[PDB]
Amino acid sequence: TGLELLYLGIFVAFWACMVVVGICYTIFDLGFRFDVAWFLTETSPFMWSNLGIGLAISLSVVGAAWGIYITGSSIIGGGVKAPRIKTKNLVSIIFCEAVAIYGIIMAIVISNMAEPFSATEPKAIGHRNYHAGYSMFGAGLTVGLSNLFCGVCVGIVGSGAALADAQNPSLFVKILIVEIFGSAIGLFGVIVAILQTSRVKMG
Amino acid sequence: HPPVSYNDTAPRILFWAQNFSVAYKDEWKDLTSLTFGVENLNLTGSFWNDSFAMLSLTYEPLFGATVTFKFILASRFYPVSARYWFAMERLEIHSNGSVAHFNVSQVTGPSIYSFHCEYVSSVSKKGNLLVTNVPSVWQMTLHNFQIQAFNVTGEQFSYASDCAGFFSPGIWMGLLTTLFMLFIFTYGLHMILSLKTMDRFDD
Amino acid sequence: PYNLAYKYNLEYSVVFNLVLWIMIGLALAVIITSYNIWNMDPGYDSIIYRMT
Amino acid sequence: NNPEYSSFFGVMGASSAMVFSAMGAAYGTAKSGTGIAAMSVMRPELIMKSIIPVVMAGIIAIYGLVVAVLIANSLTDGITLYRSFLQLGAGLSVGLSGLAAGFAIGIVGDAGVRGTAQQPRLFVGMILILIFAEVLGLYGLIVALILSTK
Amino acid sequence: NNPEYSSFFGVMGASSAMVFSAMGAAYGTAKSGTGIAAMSVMRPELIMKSIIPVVMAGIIAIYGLVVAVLIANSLTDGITLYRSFLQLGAGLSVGLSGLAAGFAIGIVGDAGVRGTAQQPRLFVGMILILIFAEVLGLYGLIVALILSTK
Amino acid sequence: NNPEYSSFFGVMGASSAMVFSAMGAAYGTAKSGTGIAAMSVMRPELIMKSIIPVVMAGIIAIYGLVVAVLIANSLTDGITLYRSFLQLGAGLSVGLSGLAAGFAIGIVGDAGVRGTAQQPRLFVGMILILIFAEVLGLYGLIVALILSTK
Amino acid sequence: NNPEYSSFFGVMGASSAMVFSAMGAAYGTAKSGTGIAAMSVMRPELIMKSIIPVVMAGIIAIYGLVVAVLIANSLTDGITLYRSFLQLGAGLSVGLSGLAAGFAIGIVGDAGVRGTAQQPRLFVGMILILIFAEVLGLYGLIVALILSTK
Amino acid sequence: NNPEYSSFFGVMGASSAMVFSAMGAAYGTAKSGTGIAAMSVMRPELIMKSIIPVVMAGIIAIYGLVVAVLIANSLTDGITLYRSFLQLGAGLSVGLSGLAAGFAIGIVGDAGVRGTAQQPRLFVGMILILIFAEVLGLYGLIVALILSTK
Amino acid sequence: NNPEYSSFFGVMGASSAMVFSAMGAAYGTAKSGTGIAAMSVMRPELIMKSIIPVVMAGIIAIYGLVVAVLIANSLTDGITLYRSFLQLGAGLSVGLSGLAAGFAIGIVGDAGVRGTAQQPRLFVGMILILIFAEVLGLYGLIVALILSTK
Amino acid sequence: NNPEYSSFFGVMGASSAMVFSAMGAAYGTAKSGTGIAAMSVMRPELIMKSIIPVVMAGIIAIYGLVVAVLIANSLTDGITLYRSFLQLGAGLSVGLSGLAAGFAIGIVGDAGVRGTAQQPRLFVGMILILIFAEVLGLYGLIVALILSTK
Amino acid sequence: NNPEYSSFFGVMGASSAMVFSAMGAAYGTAKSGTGIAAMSVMRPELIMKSIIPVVMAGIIAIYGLVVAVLIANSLTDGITLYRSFLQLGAGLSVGLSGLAAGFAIGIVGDAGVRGTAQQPRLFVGMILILIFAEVLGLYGLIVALILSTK
Amino acid sequence: NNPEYSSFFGVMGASSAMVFSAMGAAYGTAKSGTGIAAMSVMRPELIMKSIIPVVMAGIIAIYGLVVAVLIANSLTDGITLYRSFLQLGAGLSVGLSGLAAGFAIGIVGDAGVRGTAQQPRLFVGMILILIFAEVLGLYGLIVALILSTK
Ligand SMILES: *[C@@H]1O[C@H](CO)[C@@H](O[C@@H]2O[C@H](CO)[C@@H](O[C@@H]3O[C@H](CO)[C@@H](O)[C@H](O)[C@H]3NC(C)=O)[C@H](O)[C@H]2NC(C)=O)[C@H](O)[C@H]1NC(C)=O
Ligand SMILES: *[C@@H]1O[C@H](CO)[C@@H](O[C@@H]2O[C@H](CO)[C@@H](O)[C@H](O)[C@H]2NC(C)=O)[C@H](O)[C@H]1NC(C)=O
Ligand SMILES: *[C@@H]1O[C@H](CO)[C@@H](O[C@@H]2O[C@H](CO)[C@@H](O)[C@H](O)[C@H]2NC(C)=O)[C@H](O)[C@H]1NC(C)=O
Ligand SMILES: *[C@@H]1O[C@H](CO)[C@@H](O)[C@H](O)[C@H]1NC(C)=O
Ligand SMILES: *[C@@H]1O[C@H](CO)[C@@H](O)[C@H](O)[C@H]1NC(C)=O
Ligand SMILES: *[C@@H]1O[C@H](CO)[C@@H](O)[C@H](O)[C@H]1NC(C)=O
Ligand SMILES: *[C@@H]1O[C@H](CO)[C@@H](O)[C@H](O)[C@H]1NC(C)=O
């Protein structure tokens, strides 16, 4: 596969460059030019906040779409010889959208606390704004990734259940147990994203 | 072109520059001929101690009175890295019982190296040595500034930790954003390219 | 003499990034295109598949 | 106070906000078109009905435009970094959500188009699932709007 | 006070609008062409009745060229970086939207040109499907015109 | 005073702690569900039993919580770099341990569902193997605690 | 005044201006000529009438050559950022345009020559598709003549 | 005066001692599980004798846990960075050695468990290969302890 | 005054100009040789007619040598950035154009070699294609010489 | 002016001295057992005789242990750049030599056990082959001593 | 007085030149020998007439040895960085030239040693092809001496 | 004065010199062992003759063994950048030349052993080819030696 080879080439070149650069700089006693403080103090907190805000909805929507297609294709295909399964097996799609609903609510909640400031140097901004930006970025990232993996698992099991239900009517009502257990990880992601940013007082 | 050395029973403060010129009411005038070879320059106000330095150049009667440019430099022990850095903390001008502060910002190098910065004028194509508005007088063009303070050994002038820029303050933010967009565009391209079709046709 | 600095000039920290990214992009483009033009399907028609 | 680097982020947000949605809608229309080509030969009578998935994909395009002009109606030379990154976040959100919705619409449209050819009753069900796919775009738009005021 | 490098970004817009644009007009104008060969052998009568996708691909190429020529005509050497950002953003938006439109028109044409030969009715459907892809291209233009004026 | 970037490391650790645990739990749950669904056709009476794997995967998710909460409660504005490093280490350890344990439970359950479908005496044996996978996850938890409350 | 390294771009845009375009032209031949051979065992009469794709690949190559010379003859020891950066833009534009046009020309030539070996009636329509590709070359030239020139 | 950031490296060492090794042991059970899926369906009586690879994986996990606990316990505030690098090296050493041992144990157990279905005497060969396959982790543990205690 | 590593690019000019030309010629000869070996065994009469795809391919190497001797012998000790960048552009130009030309000769040589085994009348037309397949290189050489004239 | 904190590289040497070499032993086992059980389907009487391929694999592991200890025995606070670099060299040499030996012995044993399954007369001669693979490992150790001793 | 690169580049050129020559000659001779060994199965009686390609591959490695010794001899500690860059360039040039030529010789020799078993008339033609590969070798020398003198 | 980090390059040179020889001798034995195992099943008489390749790869091992010792024989603390560079060049050259020679030895040995399996007297010609491969590595051993004396 050409695309995989391209990705591997880029990745290997990147890491080889990193390793060689690091070793020569460390041997060259030039550790005073590696001042990570400047790297993580020049960056504005609002960049971290807004990246978190974008991801907190983007990744959730990606997971919702993944699960939507993965279950819908099988639901539509398997009902040709059994139209009875069209309406019985709509729970999976409902959960695949509930993921995005949680994502939107979290985006609204974190979107608050965006009062600007006037400081332009690290000594004037202070610790509080740095904490705010980092915490908001972390909350956005964790909620997005949690809901992404949640939606993927939900979609896969929804496809399995929908496909198996066409054989015997008395299957789905008990196979939906894994379907319901899918959403708990997304709920946990939302809870942690809530808790991480419960003490931000940006402004 | 020899530099200027402050001899407190040893080489203690050394200064060099390829240009150093001054303007009062926007009339630029030459001062390198009045330094770097003139041994009678007013160094009475100069002071030295480990972890402190003042270099005061009081140039001779020009435009009605002697004019004093005073560079105030300090150094302190940084806890986390366990090293000794310095920075020219301040700059003052004394003509007639008047004070100002052309505050210095972009200067810091360890006690292992000297400094260098081309075309550090102060005004438009420089962007620093700020006067905090109320712009009254005394523009001053420095080009190829160089300094060593708080410990010297002999007349030797060591290699310099030039602040020409590791990468930059801003392109780090720009590159982070653009790479983040690039990953998503590659997500799009992988699926836009690897779409598939059907062969022949149903009767 | 006094061991002066090399005269590393300002604005260099931007030109480095600019030239680096342009070079990387152009190199990647030529690599991909030549790579695709190598693994090429001639068709395997009656000229090729046929032998003996 | 604010450097000249500021409007960079807002302008790129404005561009991406629509670019990603356009790509998603294009893929959806492509997949639905090949699905229609497959479906047509046996059951012509459903053709004017099977346009329903295609127009649905087209919706995504319009949604992108609802933001793609809006951010462009607020940009100015004297803008701080804060508003610029707000615009960037709105643009990324709407663009990626449009991409995901386009993928989903294309896939389910192809599946339903193939399905109806052999079972007309499937038609109803197809549209139902497609509703969810449209909602994927809608949410992605909404947040962007409330990121243009605050 | 303006930085010297500023004009660079706008210049890249002068490239980018065209750069991806032609690429879209190389995705379709070729692929649909193969389609019109595949059944010139059997039903040559419909050779000119399904060449529409290629003309549309040319139209997206024109959509790119218009923004490119305006971009070049609005050039200067002391451009403030904000106008430079705007110009590059317009170029990127038009280019990538054009690439996507070219893709969609190409694949849909390569499918429909084959579909038409099994039954005539499908022709009507395709006159809609193709045009939907074209809508995307037009949309790109509009946003560029807001980025070159506001 | 302390540096202004101390909390960043703890923030990233708290994020990763749940991200990796969620990915592992999702994989394990998906594979167990697929196995149950595949098996359900032939042996409808074993459906309850084959749920034992999936719930096992769920427990790993809980482990993630027990870390990510604990960091978020102990984080404040001006912590020292030492505590931030400690929390980052604990978070990454538990996250990746949970991920590996999730993969193990997924594979073992996918095989064991089949083994019990075709052979009753298999079942209890595979139960033992599943416990072993869980053991790895728990070990991660231990390390994080010694690296968190210290 | 003018930086001395500024000449770099002034030449680099020239190099790319020949390379990318020319490289696409190679692709073109490698789908046209080969195809003719496959169709030249049974209809040896249609040898000379299948050279048109080759001459159009030649056309797309000469486009890149003429632009490269036009942006390379303006160089001297004191190039200013303005001119050099314009040449970079023009070279990138025309190079990628020629690349896309050559790719499309290659696919068109392959399919068309394959389709003309069984029914001559295709031939005229084949040429039509081909011209829709050749003009794309011209499109690149246009931008290059309004960036490098001014 | 030793700096404060030096402690960071030491913490990361502990992480390796519970991350990398753990992943190895994951394989050390997981592959073996699917091996059982082929063994007991015809030869179930040997299931109780087929747990040995799983116990070896547990032993690898035990080695990882003991070294990780030892590294974490010794950590303090006033560390010379040399100590931190020594701890990092020991942790990486044991982690990668345990990874190798787990991989070899998993593959060998899979091969032997599938092979015993047609050789009743494969038990001794499996054991005698497994001792060698597991000694690697013991050597890595020995050197990890000798480094850490020093 | 001038940079110390300014001559690097001057040497790299000749280096690339020789190496990529040699690579292209070698690949062309290799693939043409595979073609002659595949084809001529059935028909010995053409053992002296499929020699053109090799000897005409070898002209690439002589072109590269013509450039390389001049570039190597046009390097002085007092080279500034301007001259070095001119040399670099010339060398990269000839190298990449020669690569593309070599590729085209290789593929068209394979096609003509395997096509001439059927009927002698494919001797003429294919060689005509070959002419253009070599001009893809010739053009490039010309511009590079201009980049060494200044 | 002692060297700053070079001791880092010193420890890293020890790591390599078994991180690769020990890994090589693992690979060997993964092949040799993969041979033996296959060969056991046929001759169950030669299981004991077929373990000699395994034995030498273990021996190479011991090399990667012993040299490693001889590094960690010299560690102190005041290691200079000299000694630390010598440690790096020794560790890298022995580790990578052991890895190569492991690959060789693994492939040889895998092919050879299956080969000898049919004809015993190979076996005795094959022992000589295996010995030379082991000898490669020996040579590695020697170099990693001589450099480390100076 | 001189930089630290006064001798890094000479050694790098020598090393890389000899390494690339070795890789190229090894691949060429190995491919030719595999061709000979496979050919010998049906017509073993032609081994002693087909040793030519192996020597034609090795001669270029002799030339690489010549250039490696030459770049070695001109290296001292008071040489300006100009000659350092020049010798590195010459070494890399000859190395890659040898690599390409050796690979071409290998491919042609293997395919042709397989081919010649069925037709004696092939014998002459291949020899001519081989000399063409040898031409590339001498071209390397035409530059290898030049950079030594200027 | 001499920078203290000078010994690094000589150290890594010696390490790489031996390591690449190890890799080559591993590859050679790896291929030739499979060859002799395949051959020995049906004709055991030739086994005495077919032990040659691994015995020969041992010499490729010795090539690097001696050079590493000679390199390390002249290392101390007061090494200037010069002699360190020379040692590095010698080491890398010998290592990778031995690697390439061993690669060729392995491929040709396996193929020739398989060929001699039926008709033994190919050992007359096969062996000659083998010698050339070794001799390639000898070109390295001279050059490196020279760079160790100057
Ligand atoms: C050189 O130093 C400063 C930058 O390096 C410039 O600004 C000074 O910084 C102060 C804090 O660092 C400003 O804040 C003021 O602090 C004083 C003293 O605590 C308070 O009374 C003020 O409320 C507070 N804020 C404001 C808005 O005034 C100072 O204003 C300012 N110092 C001054 C004006 O003396 C200085 O401008 C520059 N030095 C001079 C003399 O201009
Ligand atoms: C610094 O070198 C420059 C030339 O590179 C000299 O240029 C003069 O600069 C002053 C103001 O600083 C102007 O008023 C003069 O007109 C310039 N003279 C010219 C261009 O002939 C400058 O003299 C040097 N040093 C000083 C201290 O000014
Ligand atoms: C302090 O000194 C300056 C000179 O550096 C004084 O300049 C006056 O300028 C006029 C110009 O015509 C001269 O004739 C006078 O002799 C100068 N003195 C006075 C008292 O005017 C300037 O006035 C003083 N600056 C202050 C107080 O800011
Ligand atoms: C300082 O001492 C140096 C070194 O001896 C001497 O050359 C120089 O003239 C002295 N400078 C002053 C200002 O006394
Ligand atoms: C130097 O300047 C000071 C400033 O207070 C003055 O008192 C002193 O007399 C001056 N010295 C000379 C030598 O002019
Ligand atoms: C020493 O430095 C201190 C700190 O600023 C200062 O107060 C003192 O005057 C300096 N000089 C001495 C002690 O001679
Ligand atoms: C200046 O350098 C000397 C010599 O290395 C060093 O001992 C001293 O600490 C340095 N000065 C300061 C203030 O740290």
Side-chain angles (χ1 to χ4, degrees), chain A residues 76-87:
Chain A
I76 278 296
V80 166
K81 302 305 180 189
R84 58 206 203 76
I85 74 181
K86 293 184 288 173
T87 58

Side-chain angles (χ1 to χ4, degrees), chain H residues 32-107:
Chain H
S32 268
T34 173
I36 286 296
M39 210 277 286
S40 64
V41 69
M42 320 290 201
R43 305 291 313 288
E45 56 252 78
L46 257 298
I47 267 287
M48 211 75 227
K49 268 191 175 175
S50 195
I51 298 194
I52 306 159
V54 193
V55 168
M56 294 304 173
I59 286 167
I60 297 301
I62 273 300
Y63 297 165
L65 174 60
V66 61
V67 153
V69 167
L70 177 53
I71 291 174
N73 170 25
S74 173
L75 222 34
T76 166
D77 200 339
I79 310 171
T80 87
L81 188 147
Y82 160 54
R83 296 278 187 276
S84 298
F85 274 128
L86 175 143
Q87 288 169 330
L88 175 146
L92 248 172
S93 271
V94 86
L96 303 193
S97 286
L99 181 61
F103 260 135
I105 284 158
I107 298 144

